[PDB]
Amino acid sequence: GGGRGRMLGEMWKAQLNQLTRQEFMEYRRDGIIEVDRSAARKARREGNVTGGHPVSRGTAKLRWMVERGFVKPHGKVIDLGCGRGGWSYYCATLKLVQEVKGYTKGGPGHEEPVMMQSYGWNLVSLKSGVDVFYRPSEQSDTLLCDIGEASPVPEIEEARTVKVLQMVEEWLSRGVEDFCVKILCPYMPKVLKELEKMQLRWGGGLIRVPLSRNSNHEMYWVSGASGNITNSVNTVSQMLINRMNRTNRNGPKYEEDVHLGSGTR
C-alpha cells in the first residue's frame, strides 16, 4: 500500500533530485577516484587498438574489485551487458581466464562492442544485438553483469534492478563459481528483499567501488564479499549525503588508467 518507512538511501535520491545542474555538476565527482582518460581519448581518435587503453571507465572499475579479491575471474567468463567491452577485455588479460563471451543490446542509444587487440583479445567474443533478458542461460564459471539504466524515479530503478537479479538467478545456476553483478538501486524495498534472498541462495556481498560517481548509488553484488546487506547500503547512503552537504569541494582524486597491453594469448 503506502505509508511505509523509508530507507536512508531514498532521501539521498530525493535530495539529489532537487539539486540544480550546477550543484549536481559540482557534486557528482567530488571525492571520487577518477581515472585519467586523456590518453584513451587520443587512442580512440587515432584508431589505436594496440596501445593498451581500455574502451571505457568500466575497466578500471572492475580492476579495483579484482585486485582486492572481491571477484576472481577464471575459466569461462560471460559478460551480460558488455557494452563496449571494458570488463570483457580486462578479464582476458587475467591468467586464470580461459574464455570471455560478452553480450550487449546495441542499437540506438546503446553502446556497441569495440574491436581491440589488448592482451588476450583472441579469447574475447563480443556480440551486439543481444537482449540478455530474452537469452537462454549458458554455462559459465564467472558471471559478470553491469546492466543498470538510471532514472530519476526510484520506483523505476527498483523494478529494473529486480529484473536484473531475477535474470542472473537463471545464469548463476549453470555452475557459476565467481560473479560480479551491478545493483543499480540497492536502497529500495523490493531490491533489498530480492538481494537478501539472492545472498542466501548464492552468498556474496555488496561493495561500493570508489570510482563510482556520487550522482548514483550503484553497488556491486560480488561473490568475494560478505556481510549484512542493509548495513552495507546504509554506509554508502551516509557517505553520499555527507558528500552532498559539503561546501568546500576537493574534486576527484585522479589516478592512472589500466593498461591492457596487446597481443594474443
Ligand SMILES: Nc1ncnc2c1ncn2[C@@H]1O[C@H](C[C@@H](N)CC[C@H](N)C(=O)O)[C@@H](O)[C@H]1O
Ligand atoms: N537487456 C539488455 N540486454 C543487453 N544489454 C543491455 C541491456 N540493457 C542495457 N544493456 C547494455 O549494457 C551496458 C551496460 C554498461 N554499463 C556496460 C559497461 C561495461 N562493463 C564496460 O566496462 O564498458 C549498456 O551499454 C547497455 O547498452
